[PDB]
PDB file of C-alpha atoms and ligand atoms in Angstrom:
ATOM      1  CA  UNK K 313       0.000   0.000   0.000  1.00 26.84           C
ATOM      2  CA  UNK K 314       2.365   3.091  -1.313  1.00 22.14           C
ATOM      3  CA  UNK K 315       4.576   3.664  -3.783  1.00 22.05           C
ATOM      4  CA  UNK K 316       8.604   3.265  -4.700  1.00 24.50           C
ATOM      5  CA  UNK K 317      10.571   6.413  -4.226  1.00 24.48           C
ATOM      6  CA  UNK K 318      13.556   7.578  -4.362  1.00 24.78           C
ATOM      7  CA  UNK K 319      15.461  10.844  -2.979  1.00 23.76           C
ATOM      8  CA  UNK K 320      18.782  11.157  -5.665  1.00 25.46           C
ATOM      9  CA  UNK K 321      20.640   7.949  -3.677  1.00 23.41           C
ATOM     10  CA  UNK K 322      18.050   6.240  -0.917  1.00 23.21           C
ATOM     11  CA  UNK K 323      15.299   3.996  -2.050  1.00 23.42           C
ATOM     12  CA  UNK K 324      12.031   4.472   0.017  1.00 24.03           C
ATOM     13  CA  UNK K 325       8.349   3.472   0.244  1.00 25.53           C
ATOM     14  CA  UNK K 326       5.504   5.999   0.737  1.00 28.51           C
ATOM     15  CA  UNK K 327       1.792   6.272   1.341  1.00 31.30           C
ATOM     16  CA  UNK K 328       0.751   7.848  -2.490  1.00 31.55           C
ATOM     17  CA  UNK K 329      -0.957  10.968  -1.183  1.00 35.43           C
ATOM     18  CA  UNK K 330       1.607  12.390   1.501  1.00 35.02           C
ATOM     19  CA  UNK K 331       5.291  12.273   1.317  1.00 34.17           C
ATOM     20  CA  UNK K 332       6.464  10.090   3.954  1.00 35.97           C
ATOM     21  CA  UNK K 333       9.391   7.680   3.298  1.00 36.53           C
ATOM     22  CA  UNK K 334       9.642   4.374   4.697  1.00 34.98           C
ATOM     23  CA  UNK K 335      12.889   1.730   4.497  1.00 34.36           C
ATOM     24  CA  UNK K 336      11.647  -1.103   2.019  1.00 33.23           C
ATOM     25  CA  UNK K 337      10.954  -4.807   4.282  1.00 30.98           C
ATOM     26  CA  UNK K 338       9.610  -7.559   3.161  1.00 30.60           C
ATOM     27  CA  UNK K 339       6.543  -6.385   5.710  1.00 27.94           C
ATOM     28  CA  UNK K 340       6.303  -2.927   3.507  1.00 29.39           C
ATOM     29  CA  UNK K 341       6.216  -5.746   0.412  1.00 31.39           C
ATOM     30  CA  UNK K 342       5.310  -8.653  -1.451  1.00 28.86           C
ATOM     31  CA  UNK K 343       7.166 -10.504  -4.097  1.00 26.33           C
ATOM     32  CA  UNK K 344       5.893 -12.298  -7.414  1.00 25.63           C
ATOM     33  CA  UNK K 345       8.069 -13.894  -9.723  1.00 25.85           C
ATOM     34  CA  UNK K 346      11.361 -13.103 -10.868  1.00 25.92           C
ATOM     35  CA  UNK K 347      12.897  -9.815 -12.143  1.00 27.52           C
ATOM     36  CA  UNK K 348      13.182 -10.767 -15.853  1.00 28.28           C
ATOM     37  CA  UNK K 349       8.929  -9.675 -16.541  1.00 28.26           C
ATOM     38  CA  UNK K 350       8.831  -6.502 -15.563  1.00 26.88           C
ATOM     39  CA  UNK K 351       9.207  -3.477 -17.737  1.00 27.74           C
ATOM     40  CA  UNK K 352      11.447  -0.739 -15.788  1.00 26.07           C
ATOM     41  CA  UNK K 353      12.049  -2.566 -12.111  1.00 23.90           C
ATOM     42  CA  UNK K 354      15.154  -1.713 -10.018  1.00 24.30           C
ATOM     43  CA  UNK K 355      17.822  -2.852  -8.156  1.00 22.05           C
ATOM     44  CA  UNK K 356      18.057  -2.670  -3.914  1.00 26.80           C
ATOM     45  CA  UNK K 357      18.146  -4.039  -0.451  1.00 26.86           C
ATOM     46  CA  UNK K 358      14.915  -5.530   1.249  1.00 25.68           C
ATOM     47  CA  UNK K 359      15.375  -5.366   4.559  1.00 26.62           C
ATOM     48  CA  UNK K 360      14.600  -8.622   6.652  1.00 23.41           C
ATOM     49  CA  UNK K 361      13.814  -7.570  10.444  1.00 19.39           C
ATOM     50  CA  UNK K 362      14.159 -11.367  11.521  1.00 17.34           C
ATOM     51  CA  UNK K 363      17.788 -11.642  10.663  1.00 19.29           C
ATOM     52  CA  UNK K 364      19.038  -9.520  13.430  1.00 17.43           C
ATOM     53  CA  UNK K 365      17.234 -11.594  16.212  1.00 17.72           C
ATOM     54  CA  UNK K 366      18.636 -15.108  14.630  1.00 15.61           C
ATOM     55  CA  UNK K 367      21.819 -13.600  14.315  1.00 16.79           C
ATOM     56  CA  UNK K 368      21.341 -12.420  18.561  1.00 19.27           C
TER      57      UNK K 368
ATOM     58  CA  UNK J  98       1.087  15.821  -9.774  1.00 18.43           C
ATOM     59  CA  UNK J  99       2.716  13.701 -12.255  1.00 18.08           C
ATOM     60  CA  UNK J 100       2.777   9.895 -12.532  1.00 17.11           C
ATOM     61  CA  UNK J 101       4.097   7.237 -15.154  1.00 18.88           C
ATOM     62  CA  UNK J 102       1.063   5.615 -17.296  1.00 22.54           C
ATOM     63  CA  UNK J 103       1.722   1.602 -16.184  1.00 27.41           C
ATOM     64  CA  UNK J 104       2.097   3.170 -12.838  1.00 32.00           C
ATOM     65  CA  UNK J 105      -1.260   5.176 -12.939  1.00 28.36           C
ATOM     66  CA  UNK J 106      -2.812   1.798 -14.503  1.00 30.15           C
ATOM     67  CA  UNK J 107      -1.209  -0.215 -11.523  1.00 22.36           C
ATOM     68  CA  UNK J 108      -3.128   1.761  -9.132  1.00 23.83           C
ATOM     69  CA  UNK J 109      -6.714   1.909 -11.409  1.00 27.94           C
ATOM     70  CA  UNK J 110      -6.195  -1.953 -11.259  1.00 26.13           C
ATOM     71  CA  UNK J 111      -5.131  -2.671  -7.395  1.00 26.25           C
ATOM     72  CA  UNK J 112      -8.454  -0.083  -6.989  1.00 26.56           C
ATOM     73  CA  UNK J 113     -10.720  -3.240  -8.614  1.00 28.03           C
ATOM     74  CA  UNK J 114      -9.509  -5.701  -5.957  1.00 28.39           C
ATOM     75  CA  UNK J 115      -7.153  -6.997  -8.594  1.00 29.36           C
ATOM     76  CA  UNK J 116      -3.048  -7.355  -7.451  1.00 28.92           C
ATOM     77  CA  UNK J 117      -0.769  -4.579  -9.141  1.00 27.21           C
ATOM     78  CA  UNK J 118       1.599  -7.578  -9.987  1.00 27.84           C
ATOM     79  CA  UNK J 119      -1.686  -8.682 -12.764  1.00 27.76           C
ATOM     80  CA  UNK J 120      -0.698  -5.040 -14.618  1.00 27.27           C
ATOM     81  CA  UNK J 121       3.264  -5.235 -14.964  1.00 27.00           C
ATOM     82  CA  UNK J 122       3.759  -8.776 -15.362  1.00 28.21           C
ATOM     83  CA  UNK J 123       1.089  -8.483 -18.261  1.00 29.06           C
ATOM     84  CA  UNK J 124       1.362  -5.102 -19.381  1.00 30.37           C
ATOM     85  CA  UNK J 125       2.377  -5.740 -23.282  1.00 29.14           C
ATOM     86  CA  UNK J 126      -0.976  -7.559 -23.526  1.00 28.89           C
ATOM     87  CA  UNK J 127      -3.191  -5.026 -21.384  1.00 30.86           C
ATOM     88  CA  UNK J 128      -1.292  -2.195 -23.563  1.00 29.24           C
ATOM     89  CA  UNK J 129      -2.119  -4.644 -26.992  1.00 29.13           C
ATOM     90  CA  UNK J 130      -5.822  -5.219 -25.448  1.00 25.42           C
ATOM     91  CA  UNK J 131      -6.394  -1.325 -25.070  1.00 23.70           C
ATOM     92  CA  UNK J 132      -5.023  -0.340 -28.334  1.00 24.19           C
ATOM     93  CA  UNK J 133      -6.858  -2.755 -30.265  1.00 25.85           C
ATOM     94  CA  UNK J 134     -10.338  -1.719 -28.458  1.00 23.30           C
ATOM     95  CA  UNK J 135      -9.930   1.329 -29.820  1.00 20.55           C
ATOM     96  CA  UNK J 136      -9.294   0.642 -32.692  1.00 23.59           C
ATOM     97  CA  UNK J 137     -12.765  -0.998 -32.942  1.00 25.63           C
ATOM     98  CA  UNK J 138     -14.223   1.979 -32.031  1.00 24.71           C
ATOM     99  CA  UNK J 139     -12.596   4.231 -35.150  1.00 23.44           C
ATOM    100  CA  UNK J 140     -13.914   1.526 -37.533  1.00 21.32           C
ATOM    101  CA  UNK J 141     -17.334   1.160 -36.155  1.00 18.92           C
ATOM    102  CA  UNK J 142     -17.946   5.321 -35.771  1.00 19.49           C
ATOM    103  CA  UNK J 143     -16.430   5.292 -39.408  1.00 22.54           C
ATOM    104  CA  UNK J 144     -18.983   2.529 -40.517  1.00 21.47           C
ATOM    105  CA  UNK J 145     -22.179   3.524 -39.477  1.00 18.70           C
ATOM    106  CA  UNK J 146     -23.701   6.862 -37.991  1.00 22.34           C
ATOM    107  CA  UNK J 147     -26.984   4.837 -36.189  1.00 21.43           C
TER     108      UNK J 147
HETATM  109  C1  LIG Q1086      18.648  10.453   0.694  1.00 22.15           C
HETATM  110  O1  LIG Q1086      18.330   9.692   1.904  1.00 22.15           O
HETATM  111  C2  LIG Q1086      19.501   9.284   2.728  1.00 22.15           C
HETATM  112  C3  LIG Q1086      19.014   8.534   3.977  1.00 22.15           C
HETATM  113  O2  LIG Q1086      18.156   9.383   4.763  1.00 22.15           O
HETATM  114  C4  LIG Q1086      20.357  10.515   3.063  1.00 22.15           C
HETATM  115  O3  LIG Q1086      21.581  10.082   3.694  1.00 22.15           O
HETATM  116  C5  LIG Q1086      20.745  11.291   1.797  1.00 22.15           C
HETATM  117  O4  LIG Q1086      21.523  12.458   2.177  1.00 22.15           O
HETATM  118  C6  LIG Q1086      19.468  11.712   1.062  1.00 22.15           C
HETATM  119  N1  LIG Q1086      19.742  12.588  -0.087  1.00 22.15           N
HETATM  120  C7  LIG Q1086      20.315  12.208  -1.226  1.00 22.15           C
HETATM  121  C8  LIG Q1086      20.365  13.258  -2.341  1.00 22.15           C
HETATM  122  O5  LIG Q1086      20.769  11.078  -1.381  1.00 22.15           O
HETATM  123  C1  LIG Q1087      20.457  -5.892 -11.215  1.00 22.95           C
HETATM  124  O1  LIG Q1087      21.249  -6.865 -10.462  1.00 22.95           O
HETATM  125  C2  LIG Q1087      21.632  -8.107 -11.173  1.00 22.95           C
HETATM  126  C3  LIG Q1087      22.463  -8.984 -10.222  1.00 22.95           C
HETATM  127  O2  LIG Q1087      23.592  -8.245  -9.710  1.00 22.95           O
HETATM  128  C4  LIG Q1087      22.357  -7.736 -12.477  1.00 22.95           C
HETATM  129  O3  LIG Q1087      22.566  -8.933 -13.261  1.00 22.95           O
HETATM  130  C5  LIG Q1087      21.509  -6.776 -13.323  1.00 22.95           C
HETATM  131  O4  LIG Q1087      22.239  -6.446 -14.538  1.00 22.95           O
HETATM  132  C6  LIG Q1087      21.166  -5.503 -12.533  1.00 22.95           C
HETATM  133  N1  LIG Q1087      20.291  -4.643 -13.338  1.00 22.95           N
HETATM  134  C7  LIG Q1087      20.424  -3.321 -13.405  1.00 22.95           C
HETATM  135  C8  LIG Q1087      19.310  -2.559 -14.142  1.00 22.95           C
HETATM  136  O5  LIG Q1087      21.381  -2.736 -12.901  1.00 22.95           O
END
């Protein structure tokens, strides 16, 4: 529920009708497929929140 | 406020309960599908006026 954003550098996540960026996790997201279909995707880090507390 | 068209369409589409995934994954046939409607339209306004 937003949109993909970016700031020059940062890649963020935001609500469509006010401006306030989120880091991209795979809570903020959902994947299908592979990168290969889509017309004009990007690459970055999706941050996993779980890897921390197995790595603890 | 400005916003690319396959973007816009993602957003008309995850507004009919439908996942924006279904747009950009098939986008070359929604963008085929659309094109070709209307060109059904120019040749049925150019073939009759009823
Ligand atoms: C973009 O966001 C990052 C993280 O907040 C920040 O460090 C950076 O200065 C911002 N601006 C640009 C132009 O990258
Ligand atoms: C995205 O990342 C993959 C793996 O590193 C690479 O093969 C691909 O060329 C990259 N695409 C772009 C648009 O940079």
């Amino acid at each position: 529920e937003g949109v993909f954003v970016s700031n020059g550098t940062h890649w963020f996540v935001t609500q469509r009708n006010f401006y306030e960026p989120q880091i991209i996790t795979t809570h903020n997201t959902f994947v299908s497929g592979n990168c290969d279909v889509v017309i004009g995707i990007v690459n970055n880090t999706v941050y996993d929140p779980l890897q921390p507390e197995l790595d603890s | 406020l400005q916003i690319p068209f396959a973007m816009q369409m993602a957003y008309r589409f995850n507004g009919i309960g439908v996942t924006q995934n279904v747009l950009y994954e098939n986008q070359k046939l929604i963008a085929n599908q659309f094109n070709s409607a209307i060109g059904k339209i120019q040749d049925s306004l150019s073939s009759t006026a009823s």
